[PDB]
RNA sequence: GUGGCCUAUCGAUCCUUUAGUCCCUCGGAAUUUGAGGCUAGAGGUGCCAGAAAAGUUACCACAGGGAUAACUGGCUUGUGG
RNA sequence: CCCUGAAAAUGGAUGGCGCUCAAGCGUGUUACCUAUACUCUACCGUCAGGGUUGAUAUGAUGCCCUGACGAGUAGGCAGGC
RNA sequence: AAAUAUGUAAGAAGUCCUUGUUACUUAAUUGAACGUGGACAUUUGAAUGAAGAGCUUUUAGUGGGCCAUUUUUGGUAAGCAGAACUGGCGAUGCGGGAUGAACCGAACGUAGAGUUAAGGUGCCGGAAUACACGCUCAUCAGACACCACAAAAGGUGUUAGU
RNA sequence: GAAUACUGCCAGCUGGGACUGAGGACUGCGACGUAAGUCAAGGAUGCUGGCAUAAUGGUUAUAUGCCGCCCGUCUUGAAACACGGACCAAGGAGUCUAACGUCUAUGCGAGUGUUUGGGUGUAAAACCCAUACGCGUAAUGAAAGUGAACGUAGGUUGGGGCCUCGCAAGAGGUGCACAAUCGACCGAUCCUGAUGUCUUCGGAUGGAUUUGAGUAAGAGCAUAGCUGUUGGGACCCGAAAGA
């Protein structure tokens, strides 16, 4: 009889989507990401800085 | 606003209810209306529109229609069912032994079923006998043998008849339809 | 589809949506088009019931269909109504909406900032 | 007949009611009113006066008694939202609250036949007064200008922002 | 019933149904039948083809008695015998004692030739026969006598 | 076409089953690498005006 | 090869007349003249889908028209200044 | 940009008052205002799709569920006073 | 020799393989047309949409139009006359252009809340006498498209530039 | 080597404001719970106060803020410096009829129509009825004339429904109406011309880029209704004229 939206009423986010549940258990929306040490090519660099 | 690519608030184009007022045509409605609706049969939405139908929509059915639609091999045993009035026909000199579930029988078409050996049957016994319309037949009259037909479409060289109230000659039998008299149509 | 696009520019601002725009439209603005009917899916039953023939049975199965375009993107949008959103609230950020907004308006392709503006309108 | 008849009548038989998915969970107070804040009445006949807050019964009003003695206000209730919950404080840990509650701030029933045309406190009210002052006025008189500051009203002046003072 | 008419309902409507331009008139385009050959041209030359002119010679006193001559078909030639005896005849298809059937007195003039009447002989009285009507009477083992 | 879809269908009856028989539009490119290998971008802005007449 | 190298160079009903079929009718029954029919052309409507048609009204009449002229006004400004 | 070029007849028109690092002109960024437009909810009506008979507590032209839609002259039809 | 506009096709009424009819056709057991039988799958042969798709009868009013962008004819020109495509007004309210049939936005059941369009925010008048960079001082300044006007020419006024 | 800005994400948390509370037993999907149950999960409940009447509200007059041009008509365009309208009451304009078209309802249906007339009557009613006649059941041709099955009343393509097998998907069979097409038959036109013979008659077979408002297991007749048509005063009013 009434939409009851989701992204609210986590009742109504719940019943859709029964992985909302593990998503923020695990909190999954802050997903601290792996450093990774490359480094741009001399080329790339030189041709940004060039008029 | 909208950008309405149909009409709004279009009605079917179809009949929902029998024109007429006869309380028992609307009998058989609601009871074929019931059948239509609690069956997955579509031999019961096909009679139960048919019951909707105008006279010049159930078009007579003669017997000797009934009897050429015995012929089919497979059709002899089953049942006939017409939802409109079965005519007699002294063209036909032998009826097979068959039952047939019609509207209207003239007294001509009744006695000459039931002297062939068969009986003569209303639309509420046949769904008794037959909830599903098992082994039945729908047969249907020649809509298009009305002589109001003949003027439809009326136009140059189409072929149809002029609506006159005199024939003969004298009546639209020259100029215009003779190359002796101008041109021809 | 690009000729399409092309041929009504003036009369659409149109882009491409992230994952976090689609899932959000579908949830809450997200109607079924059922026996010529606009259903709200509200429920997972409802999606499987029209689209699981389609291997699709969630309303996250419908997004996934949308967000990569796989074999059943067609059978999946259509099925979808088409989403009526709303005026948005901050504006339109510019004075005039009817120039390209290469030119300082609003229609026209905008590339990436349509999820700026789609999720302010619904 | 002068009008004929409707066919058929309405059901006069008065359906129950759907089953009601509402809770009475308990009141979410806000953060500043913690028992011994000095409220200041926003409302009411005792407006504008400064009260020393004690209790919060169970009918979510608060329990409150800006001491009799200082200012002429009783132990009454008063609604949250009609009050000022001030930065100046008082410890409570003196006074004895369990007793007071809604049953024993209820009125009367009231005769319906009982009006009068043209026009007393009770014992147990007034010592219960007595006995919640000692302790209050006991501690209040330990920090220099607290019962001036209770026996004084509250105004707003010519030039009084109040969306941007402090209480 | 007028209470039915579309009048009752264009009461209070200032042009009755009839356009505010048009401005329902006496008789705009003529009265009758007139201008079937200018201005009501192509009406008469798409639905009344032949309207104009002259076809055929003329024939002065013609009495339709003279032309009486109302057609049956072997199809409906044995409806002539009534039904009870319709049966008994129809068995026993016999030759030395088939049934006479006089379409004067029946009032027709002429028999024609429809066909497939039953395989039974008929004695057929009639002021005219066509060919190939008779020869199915001959053929069901009947004969045709013509009479006056 | 319809002479090789034929031939198609039938050799993907033998091996390759569902051979995409149906045509299709012209898709969105995909990605790719480009190299700078002996191909430094360079270029400059806008020429200024000139008559020429 | 079913007229002019292609794109224009033309004509209904009624009536008259000619050619053809040797054909149908003249209705009480026949013969012969005569007439009427059926098929195909011509005789013509150039206002060319085709009435048979001279003026005048300053003595005038009617139905209307700002669908439309003779003032002003409005747009324009060739012409005038 | 401003000025000269720059003359019409009642007294008058950036809409008015007024405005001069503008309340003018060019450009840019934000905030804010409000349509019978867009979104959500309710109600009215129309249309479409449906449910409802081991008697639907005997009205199935009834009751109910779901969705969409609503401008209007000439005009057409239907339901009503 | 464009652009725009326009014809056709994208299959089951199809494709392929055998072989029957004919008075047509072939030098012919050659073809043509129509068929018998057999084979082809589920992406049945591009995309998007499909509000149901088709068919028939019968009858009203209309048959004075006009405006706008773009193409365009006559005319010096016209709120002039005549055409083309589309959209409008006529038939239409609502917000803006003060004012207006056509312009901008948006099309309309009865209400509530929210957000906007076009247009605006000194006061009239709801909304910043907001912010930022510059230009102008007119003894006839200027101040929003349709639109209710101004030109050639000239100025050590002032600013920027070659 | 860090931070910050900018842009983006969270199925991160949280405060204040406003509008709304539609339904009326249960059913559903869920969540939290070992389970028992509880819950913000298919639409508001709980607690409290004042009044119980002109208090809210309706009506009406007035005031205030904003808006509002005179209706009807002709017209591309009306508030128009276009026309009618000083005011009020009563009257005032698509009717009936003959014939007909489409559609709808009804009765009977290869038939249909009693009411010209007759019988009868409680007397312009109701009831009953013969023979005729009208329309239909046959068309075509100018006419004399002729006059509708080679065939399961044909073949093909679709075709609802029904039947058989199938859990089904589907595959077969029969396929009314209807639609397209090729055939067959009847009449007219053109042609060919058998036996025979009042030797000029008869017209058998066999055909065709011909033609019909035809046949091919009838649908009509009658009554009634809206709408439309023609003639009538003809939706109402109005000429200058003519006899
Ligand atoms: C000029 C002359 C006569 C003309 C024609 O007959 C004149 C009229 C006569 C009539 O009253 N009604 C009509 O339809 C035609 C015709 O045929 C030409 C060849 C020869």
Known sequence: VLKKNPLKNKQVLLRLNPYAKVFAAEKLGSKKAEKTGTKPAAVFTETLKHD | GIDHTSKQHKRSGHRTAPKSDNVYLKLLVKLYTFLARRTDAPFNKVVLKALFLSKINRPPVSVSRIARALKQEGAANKTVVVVGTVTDDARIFEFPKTTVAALRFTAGARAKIVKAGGECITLDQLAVRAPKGQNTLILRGPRNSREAVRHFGMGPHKGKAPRILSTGRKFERARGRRRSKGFKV | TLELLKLIEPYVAYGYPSYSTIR????????????????????????????????????????????????????????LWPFKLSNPSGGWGVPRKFKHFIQGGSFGNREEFINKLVKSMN | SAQKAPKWYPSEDVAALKKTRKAARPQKLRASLVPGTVLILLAGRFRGKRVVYLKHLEDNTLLISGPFKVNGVPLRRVNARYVIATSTKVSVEGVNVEKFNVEYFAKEKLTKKEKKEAKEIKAERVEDQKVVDKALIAEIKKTPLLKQYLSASFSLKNGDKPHMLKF | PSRFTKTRKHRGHVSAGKGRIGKHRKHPGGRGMAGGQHHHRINMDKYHPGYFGKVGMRYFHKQQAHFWKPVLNLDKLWTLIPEDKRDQYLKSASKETAPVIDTLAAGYGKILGKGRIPNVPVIVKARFVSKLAEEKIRAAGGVVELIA | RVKANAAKRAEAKAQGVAVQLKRQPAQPRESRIVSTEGNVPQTLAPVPYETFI
């Open chain 3, 24 to 79: 959000q439209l579908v949830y809450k603005r997200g109607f079924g088009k059922i026996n010529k009917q606009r259903v709200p899916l509200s429920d997972n039953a409802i999606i499987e019931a029209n689209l699981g023939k389609y291997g699709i049975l969630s309303i996250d199965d419908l997004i996934h269909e949308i967000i990569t375009v796989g074999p059943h993107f067609k059978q999946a949008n259509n099925f």
